Scaffold this active site. Structure first.
Site, PDB file in Angstrom:
ATOM      1  CD  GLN A   1     121.396  68.074 -62.835  1.00  0.00           C
ATOM      2  OE1 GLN A   1     122.423  68.114 -62.153  1.00  0.00           O
ATOM      3  NE2 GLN A   1     120.224  67.814 -62.323  1.00  0.00           N
TER       4      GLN A   1
ATOM      5  CB  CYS B   1     122.576  66.237 -59.176  1.00  0.00           C
ATOM      6  SG  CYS B   1     121.481  65.791 -57.809  1.00  0.00           S
TER       7      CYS B   1
ATOM      8  CG  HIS C   1     120.862  69.726 -55.946  1.00  0.00           C
ATOM      9  ND1 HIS C   1     119.916  70.400 -55.209  1.00  0.00           N
ATOM     10  CD2 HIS C   1     120.368  69.645 -57.205  1.00  0.00           C
ATOM     11  CE1 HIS C   1     118.903  70.731 -55.988  1.00  0.00           C
ATOM     12  NE2 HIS C   1     119.152  70.278 -57.206  1.00  0.00           N
TER      13      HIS C   1
ATOM     14  CG  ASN D   1     126.357  71.565 -59.849  1.00  0.00           C
ATOM     15  OD1 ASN D   1     125.771  70.527 -60.019  1.00  0.00           O
ATOM     16  ND2 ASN D   1     125.909  72.492 -59.023  1.00  0.00           N
TER      17      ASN D   1
HETATM   18  C1  LIG Z   1     119.875  66.181 -58.303  1.00  0.00           C
HETATM   19  N1  LIG Z   1     119.644  66.483 -59.512  1.00  0.00           N
HETATM   20  C2  LIG Z   1     118.796  66.086 -57.274  1.00  0.00           C
HETATM   21  N2  LIG Z   1     119.222  65.652 -55.962  1.00  0.00           N
HETATM   22  C3  LIG Z   1     119.363  64.398 -55.576  1.00  0.00           C
HETATM   23  O1  LIG Z   1     119.208  63.423 -56.289  1.00  0.00           O
HETATM   24  C4  LIG Z   1     119.729  64.302 -54.112  1.00  0.00           C
HETATM   25  C5  LIG Z   1     121.125  63.741 -53.901  1.00  0.00           C
HETATM   26  C6  LIG Z   1     121.089  63.066 -52.538  1.00  0.00           C
HETATM   27  S1  LIG Z   1     121.509  64.147 -51.279  1.00  0.00           S
HETATM   28  O2  LIG Z   1     122.867  64.551 -51.509  1.00  0.00           O
HETATM   29  O3  LIG Z   1     120.548  65.209 -51.305  1.00  0.00           O
HETATM   30  C7  LIG Z   1     121.316  63.324 -49.855  1.00  0.00           C
HETATM   31  C8  LIG Z   1     120.206  63.490 -49.024  1.00  0.00           C
HETATM   32  C9  LIG Z   1     120.039  62.733 -47.855  1.00  0.00           C
HETATM   33  C10 LIG Z   1     120.959  61.760 -47.446  1.00  0.00           C
HETATM   34  N3  LIG Z   1     120.760  60.975 -46.261  1.00  0.00           N
HETATM   35  C11 LIG Z   1     119.985  61.495 -45.124  1.00  0.00           C
HETATM   36  C12 LIG Z   1     119.365  60.372 -44.295  1.00  0.00           C
HETATM   37  N4  LIG Z   1     120.362  59.370 -43.874  1.00  0.00           N
HETATM   38  C13 LIG Z   1     119.726  58.257 -43.131  1.00  0.00           C
HETATM   39  C14 LIG Z   1     119.067  58.698 -41.838  1.00  0.00           C
HETATM   40  C15 LIG Z   1     121.083  58.813 -45.036  1.00  0.00           C
HETATM   41  C16 LIG Z   1     121.688  59.877 -45.949  1.00  0.00           C
HETATM   42  C17 LIG Z   1     122.060  61.579 -48.265  1.00  0.00           C
HETATM   43  C18 LIG Z   1     122.204  62.341 -49.419  1.00  0.00           C
HETATM   44 CL1  LIG Z   1     123.626  61.933 -50.346  1.00  0.00          CL
HETATM   45  C19 LIG Z   1     119.653  62.540 -52.463  1.00  0.00           C
HETATM   46  N5  LIG Z   1     118.858  63.402 -53.345  1.00  0.00           N
HETATM   47  C20 LIG Z   1     117.530  63.500 -53.473  1.00  0.00           C
HETATM   48  O4  LIG Z   1     117.006  64.312 -54.227  1.00  0.00           O
HETATM   49  C21 LIG Z   1     116.608  62.603 -52.681  1.00  0.00           C
HETATM   50  C22 LIG Z   1     116.359  61.223 -53.292  1.00  0.00           C
HETATM   51  F1  LIG Z   1     117.478  60.546 -53.455  1.00  0.00           F
HETATM   52  F2  LIG Z   1     115.546  60.519 -52.537  1.00  0.00           F
HETATM   53  F3  LIG Z   1     115.797  61.421 -54.476  1.00  0.00           F
HETATM   54  C23 LIG Z   1     115.495  63.287 -51.900  1.00  0.00           C
HETATM   55  C24 LIG Z   1     116.679  62.689 -51.145  1.00  0.00           C
HETATM   56  C25 LIG Z   1     117.413  65.566 -57.695  1.00  0.00           C
HETATM   57  C26 LIG Z   1     117.617  67.036 -57.350  1.00  0.00           C
END
Ligand SMILES: *C(=N)C1(NC(=O)[C@@H]2C[C@@H](S(=O)(=O)c3ccc(N4CCN(CC)CC4)cc3Cl)CN2C(=O)C2(C(F)(F)F)CC2)CC1
Length: 219
Positions: free
Chosen positions: A20, A26, A166, A186
């Protein structure tokens, strides 16, 4: 009754580990990985699908993905549903930047009809899905340096939390030297973990949040 050990790599359902880079994609790699598994199971063809297509084309309020700023596997699936398709990596290659969407329907390589979310924290439900459905997209807490120190065995860091950050792909499970694990693909290239994979503790109180936010697409 479920098998004790599963590895979708052995069924030809898992593509090469991707890199990536410094783009927070990710989530996109996790999502295409899950859909690659389904595409193979349904069509018989294993084809790397376009993480870049997700990055470029789902960066809007409708989805709440942020391209290289991060995103959600579920919303990636929703984009593919809404869009009526996704391209292969070969025709829409990974650039590790936010670019203007240039999806071409003539190059469609897969579709998505719906996605399934598994119950929060339920490692038995994840086991069943991995055994019977295919690779499953999951979120983990991958923020501890120990995660990048892993080379072999089963990753089981007491500092891990349920606060995930992630997206990765569960491609199997088993028990290694008496320790239950999840086999995780990963997107940090071959040099990460064990040839791009990590075995993470399974049945240990939802370690690293691995069964918190599990989903998979249907073709
Ligand atoms: C990858 N290179 C990076 N990580 C992401 O893009 C993550 C992946 C997903 S997650 O797996 O961390 C994640 C987090 C939270 C949820 N929620 C919690 C709240 N619920 C409702 C109350 C719904 C589900 C699900 C998941 Cl799958 C999101 N990632 C993020 O970095 C975020 C965002 F998508 F907003 F960018 C910050 C959450 C970029 C390092």
């Amino acid at each position: 009754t479920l098998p004790d050990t599963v590895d979708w790599r052995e069924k030809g359902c898992v593509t090469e580990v991707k890199y990536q880079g410094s783009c927070g994609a990710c989530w996109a790699f996790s999502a295409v990985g899950a859909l690659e598994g389904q595409l193979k199971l349904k069509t018989g063809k294993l084809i790397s699908l376009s993480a870049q297509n997700l990055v470029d084309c789902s960066n809007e309020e409708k989805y709440g993905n942020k391209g290289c700023g991060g995103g959600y596997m579920t919303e990636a699936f929703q984009y593919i549903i809404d869009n009526g398709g996704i391209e292969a990596d070969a025709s829409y290659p990974y650039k590790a930047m936010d670019e203007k969407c240039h999806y071409n329907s003539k190059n469609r390589a897969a579709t998505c009809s719906r996605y399934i979310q598994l119950p929060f924290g339920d490692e038995d439900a994840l086991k069943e899905a991995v055994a019977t459905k295919g690779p499953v997209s999951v979120g983990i807490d991958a923020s501890h340096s120990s995660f990048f120190f892993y080379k072999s065995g089963v990753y089981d860091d007491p500092s891990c939390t349920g606060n995930v950050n992630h997206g990765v792909l569960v491609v199997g499970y088993g028990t290694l030297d008496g320790k239950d694990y999840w086999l995780v693909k990963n997107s940090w290239g071959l040099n990460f973990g064990d040839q791009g994979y990590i075995r993470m503790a399974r049945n240990n109180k939802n370690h690293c949040g691995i069964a918190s936010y599990c989903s998979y697409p249907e073709i």
